[PDB]
């Protein structure tokens, strides 16, 4: 791929989009979202981190002859909801919870076109399920479950195994994060792949590892 956007196949219908941003002192580092393909229809889980990443993603999807039906953003930060304004211009439906829209509005950013007003939401009929586990990385963070592939998109609610801390905690509830994670652990014992917002894909250990990081940071 390019220095802005890499795509990695996770299964027949599911791609991981990895978008890059310069964050000193690490150089270029990736944010992960998904593309889910349902027949002639494509769906974005999180927007890429840069507007350029997003335009390259739209081109790569539309170059397969797929219509981008919808996008769901997993929290109010730029590495998940950064290109809500572009998608809304292109008349691609954006989905965000009422909590995500509250925090976008509070930070003077455009809200989603469509509001999720439930703790569980069927983002793509029989293909993608949204769950709100409670506060963790942010008040508003959600996870996305792909029942056909047994893929859980954790976003920034979930840390990579290698990560030894929680990253940016300025909007975090470190006290609730372990109880929130226990809900996700209890809901998805069948998860084969967990996608963190940053770093390597893994198994359920990533859930238990994030819970442990959070339990220790309270000390
Ligand atoms: C500041 C970041 C980024 C921010 C965030 O989502 O809080 C984003 C808004 O810039 N996501 C974050 C997080 O805490 O999850 C942080 S860490 C970032 C992603 N992985 C890299 C990392 O921590 N490495 C060890 C390479 C840098
Ligand atoms: Zn974040
Ligand atoms: Zn992040």
Number of domains: 1
SSE string, helix = H, strand = E? Answer: EEEEHEHHEHEEEEEHEH
CATH superfamily: Ribonuclease Z/Hydroxyacylglutathione hydrolase-like
| Tally of alpha and pi helices | 6
Strand content: 25-35%
Q: How many angstroms does the end-to-end distance come to?
A: 42 Å
Helix content: 25-40%
Give your account of this protein's structure:
This protein is of the alpha/beta class. It has a single domain, classed as Ribonuclease Z/Hydroxyacylglutathione hydrolase-like (Metallo-beta-lactamase, Chain A), CATH 3.60.15.10. The protein has 6 helices and 12 strands. The strands form 2 sheets. It has a 7-stranded mixed β-sheet with strand order 1-2-3-4-5-6-7. Helix 5 packs antiparallel against helix 6. The longest helix is centred in the C-terminal third of the chain and has 13 residues. The radius of gyration is 16 Å and the shape is globular. The termini are far apart. 44% of the residues are buried. The structure holds the ligand C[C@@H]1[C@H]([C@H](C(=O)O)[C@@H](C)O)N=C(C(=O)O)[C@H]1S[C@@H]1CN[C@H](C(=O)N(C)C)C1 and zinc ion (ZN) (2 copies). One zinc ion (ZN) binds next to loops.
């Amino acid at each position: 791929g390019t220095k802005e956007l890499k795509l990695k196949k996770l299964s027949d219908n599911v791609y991981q989009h990895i978008s890059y941003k310069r964050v000193e002192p690490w150089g270029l580092i990736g944010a992960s979202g998904l593309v889910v393909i349902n027949g002639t229809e494509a769906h974005m889980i999180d927007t890429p981190w840069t507007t350029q990443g997003t335009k390259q993603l739209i081109e790569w999807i539309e170059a397969k002859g797929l219509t981008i039906k919808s996008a769901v953003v997993t929290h109010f930060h730029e590495d998940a909801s950064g290109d809500i304004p572009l998608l809304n211009d292109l008349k691609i439906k954006t989905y965000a919870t009422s909590l995500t829209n509250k925090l976008l509005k509070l930070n003077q950013k455009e809200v989603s076109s469509d509001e999720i007003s439930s703790n569980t939401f069927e983002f793509i009929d029989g293909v993608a399920s949204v769950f709100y586990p409670g506060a963790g990385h942010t008040e508003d963070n959600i996870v996305v479950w792909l029942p056909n592939e047994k893929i859980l998109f954790g976003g920034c609610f979930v840390k990579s195994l290698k990560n030894k801390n929680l990253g940016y905690t300025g909007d975090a509830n470190i006290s609730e994060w372990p109880n929130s994670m226990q809900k996700v652990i209890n809901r998805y014992p069948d998860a084969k792949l967990v996608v963190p917002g940053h770093g390597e894909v893994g198994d359920v250990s990533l859930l238990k590892h994030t819970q442990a990081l959070a339990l220790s940071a309270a000390a």
